[PDB]
Amino acid sequence: GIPTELKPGTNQFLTTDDGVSAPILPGFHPTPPIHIPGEVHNLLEICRV
Amino acid sequence: GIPTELKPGTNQFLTTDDGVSAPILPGFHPTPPIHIPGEVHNLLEICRVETILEVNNLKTNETTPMQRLCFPVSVQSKTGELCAAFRADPGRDGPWQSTILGQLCRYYTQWSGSLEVTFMFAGSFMATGKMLIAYTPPGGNVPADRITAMLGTHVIWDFGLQSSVTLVVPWISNTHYRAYFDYYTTGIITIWYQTNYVVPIGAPTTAYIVALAAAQDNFTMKLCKDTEDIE
Amino acid sequence: GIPTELKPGTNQFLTTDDGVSAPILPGFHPTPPIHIPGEVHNLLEICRVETILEVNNLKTNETTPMQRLCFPVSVQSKTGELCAAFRADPGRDGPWQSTILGQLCRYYTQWSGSLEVTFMFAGSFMATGKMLIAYTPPGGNVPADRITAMLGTHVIWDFGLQSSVTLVVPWISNTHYRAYFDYYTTGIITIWYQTNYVVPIGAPTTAYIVALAAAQDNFTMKLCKDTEDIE
Amino acid sequence: NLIETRCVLNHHSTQETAIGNFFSRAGLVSIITMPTTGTQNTDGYVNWDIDLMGYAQLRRKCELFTYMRFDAEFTFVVAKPNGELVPQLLQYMYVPPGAPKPTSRDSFAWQTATNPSVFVKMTDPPAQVSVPFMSPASAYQWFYDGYPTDLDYGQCPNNMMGTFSIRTVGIEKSPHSITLRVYMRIKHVRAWIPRPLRNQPYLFKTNPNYKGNDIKCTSTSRDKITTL
Amino acid sequence: NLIETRCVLNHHSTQETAIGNFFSRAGLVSIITMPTTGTQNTDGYVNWDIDLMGYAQLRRKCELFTYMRFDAEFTFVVAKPNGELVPQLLQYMYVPPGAPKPTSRDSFAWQTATNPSVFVKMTDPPAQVSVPFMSPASAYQWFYDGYPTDLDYGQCPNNMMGTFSIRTVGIEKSPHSITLRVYMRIKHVRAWIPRPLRNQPYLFKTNPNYKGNDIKCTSTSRDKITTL
Amino acid sequence: ACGYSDRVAQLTIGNSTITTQEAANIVIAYGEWPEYCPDTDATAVDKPTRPDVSVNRFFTLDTKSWAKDSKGWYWKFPDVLTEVGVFGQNAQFHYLYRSGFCVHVQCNASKFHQGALLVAVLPEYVLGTIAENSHPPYATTQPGQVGAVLTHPYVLDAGIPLSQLTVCPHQWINLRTNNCATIIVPYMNTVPFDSALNHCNFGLLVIPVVPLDFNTGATSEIPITVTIAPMCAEFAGLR
What we know:
This is part of a larger assembly, with 3 copies of chain A, 2 copies of chain D and 1 copy of chain F.
Chain A: E1 2-4, E2 13-14, H1 44-47
Chain D: H1 19-22, E1 27-34, E2 45-49, H2 56-62, E3 65-79, E4 89-95, E5 117-121, E6 127-131, E7 140-141, E8 163-168, E9 178-194
Antiparallel strand pairs in D: 1-9, 2-8, 3-6, 3-7, 3-9, 4-5, 4-8
Chain F: E1 2-3, E2 10-12, E3 17-19, E4 27-28, E5 59-60, E6 64-66, E7 73-77, H1 85-93, E8 96-107, E9 114-123, H2 138-141, E10 148-149, E11 170-174, E12 178-185, E13 202-213, E14 222-236
Parallel strand pairs in F: 4-12
Antiparallel strand pairs in F: 1-12, 2-3, 5-14, 6-14, 7-10, 7-13, 8-12, 8-14, 9-11, 9-13
PDB class: virus
Keywords: virus, hand-foot-and-mouth disease, pocket factor, icosahedral virus
Chains A, B, C: Polyprotein, capsid protein VP3
């Protein structure tokens, strides 16, 4: 196998870590989105009101 | 999955390992930098700066330290007598401890290069005379009289002509070890009175010399180690 | 994350594994190398160097070891009598232990190649005579008399003409095992008196021969193993 | 001593004297202890505000410069007071500046999504995390010749890097005492405006005050200016 | 014996006789023992100066050359004296040359950022670290025909490779006794000026002195120079 | 190197002239020619003095006498010329030193004499004692011009076999043929310049492996004469 060395930080759960988890339902195809007017992208859009 | 094999050194924390850790705040955009003059990139930039040597580091000075910053010359001194003397040992104790160079040397284990010592004369514009500066190479016998010093590497300095003069220590080296001993290869600077101090009526008969020193460009250091200068 | 599966051998430390460990001092720049003549790259370079064989390794010598470095010839010896004899067994005990080759052979398990033995005559320039050198191939009967030795691989050496002569052991092999036994295929060198030692009036009637030996280029070894020469 | 032999005739690498190499390496910046019961632990938690001027060793090194900018890597080496490890689940929470710190072993603070927290078992290898450049200014500054508004002189709150709140997880108190060593490493260092090196013993964390009766000389002394 | 059969008629690989292969493999260079209480352990720590001339086996191999240059890989195999492992946190600190060594189980030395330290649990697999070429000279030398300034003859301090300081972490002493085996492997070897192979028993680590009354012969003996 | 059937030659270097037979049977230690030190930061700010004056010449040491019982001799370098001539005062006032050497060992014997000497150069020739702990005295570690006598030649006073000394730059002197050896030794150290007074870069050994013999009536002592010539000598005082 490939020689690896576990470094400090192994096995830790950081509430701000942005990883990838296993999809609980791999066969599921979520209902597709449609157009809904008024989509907001950044809170500052609201602050300018 | 991918066949892996954990090798020795797994799960260890090495204080000198240089890894990558998870950003505690991924969404944060640190305040951006602006221009601040005087950014330093390497400590040697600081070592090339002349700082004041406490050549006059007497036990009787300790209570009036301001007097260590300069030594004096006077009329009482006879032609040919020794004025001052110290060696070129940046890291070790002594006059060099006051300089920025010697302070940074303690933060390292080895070093080597050239040094330059500058002497400045502060006395009345009416004073004149000649001092003899001499560098006695490492493993050499300190000059006994003015005449022998003259036969070695020296500089006749006439402070009636130049208010300042610079000497260059060609090469010093150090290899700090324990047993505490320094593999310090270093010379001895000796200041002699070539002529006596000459002055007219109305002028102070005692003036002072200020000594500044710095490392040249070829100076370099290696192997860090926290100092012993603090407690 | 990346799906991995730890396979057998995980967490093991193999003294012969050749991995990469974390540098204890990442900021350190090791002193750079300079040129030093005589760098060695392979031990065989050393094995090709002639070293002195202790052919005269008698029990009576032990207290005056300097005498093992050379054996002698004399007038008392009659034409045709056996002078000395030893086999070409670098690794094993005996004369070869004194050579640099035999010492390095103990640091390995197997070896094979050619060897060359050189004989040097030290006696008076006035002496003359002929010695017969003979190599008896492995699994061969050691020569009984001078005449039979002559029928095999031999060299008539006239030290009145050449002060030195070199013999070449064509091929030896070894495959060291335990049960301790050596699968050593090796011959027997025999030195005979072809003629008696001739000398005029005024010259020593006893002279010495020095034996040097080394491995040739085709010599090679494999499978390391710490020696038994020390304690 | 001064043994004058073995002369190094080669120049060493300048990399060793670079600001980065000078401030690298993880050093111990704090030692928190959480005993089962003693003086300050019927609580069950600890609040350590990130402080560099903690160890005079590192502090002196920083005060060689006026301004500095850098990232910090923190490693959490914990175990019981005697070095033994047990299957204890711990939580380390980073409370940014301007955020509310836990005031009890179970404040709401511990549940606040915005206070990043890292959960790790004392058995797992040391947790490691990197904290960026928090100041609202372009650089941290070890010297402020003004007032942030006297007793609040030299105090610049824009150097506030955050707080780390440690505690054992679980509703009931932990049976084990914990001794945690916090290591910090400075990454991507940048320094400006070099200044004289501290030559007087330190008296306080927040100011250059020095003992004015016992003013020590920068260098040792000797009898005559000619004896060497 | 001398069984003359099975003749190897092929040349073997020369790679096996190369300086590198000859000095490879991790060998045991030291065995430190730290019992709970006995003779030298009311301390709680150990200072092992890195020494190669430790085992005569490896020493003889090196003294085949005058100068050598190389990197060293150290592996730390620890466990209790009977082979059992326990959840004990240990610390191994490398004190470079010219640096101050710990003098107590809790000296400041253990906190000095410049003395790289590696923390590992006795349960974790053996710690492994590489130490470079420390000498201030171009190569280590096993022979110095001079004086570094008699009783200090042959002594060259430029071979000083450093010290390893072991200890259990934690403020209180560890309940367990520890037996630690230190393995070392020589990487990137280079050798110069080959010399005669030691043929006399060693008497000291720091010098070639040999027993002069009992001078052993390089080779075994026999009766006649013709009997074989 | 030099023996019978060689055209006699008269070599001169400075104010010195030695008559020695021209035998291009010379040994060049470790395959390299003595050279002037490559550049180094130290002597890049303080050039190295290369006194070609009365320093690059033939220093002929006092002749040693070889008898039927001699055990062998050895000299240390640069120590041997430390107490001699301008190479001495030049090697004392200068902090750093560096040099090479043409070494020439020569015998004078009749054809009715017999013997064999091994001449070898051993870098960093550290010596031992019979022993308890006791590092050898300064008088036997640095013998000077006179040189010193081996006490246990079989192990070269250092616990190493003489039988293996040939893995070092050597040359045999078999009275039967040649009567003189020549060896060119280049600077060997772990640093460009060392102290000429502290460290002895190597040792010259002359050990009789096949003892002197002759019939009573012939000169009982054969003279061994050593001649040294520095090659590419450099000094750096650092001033």
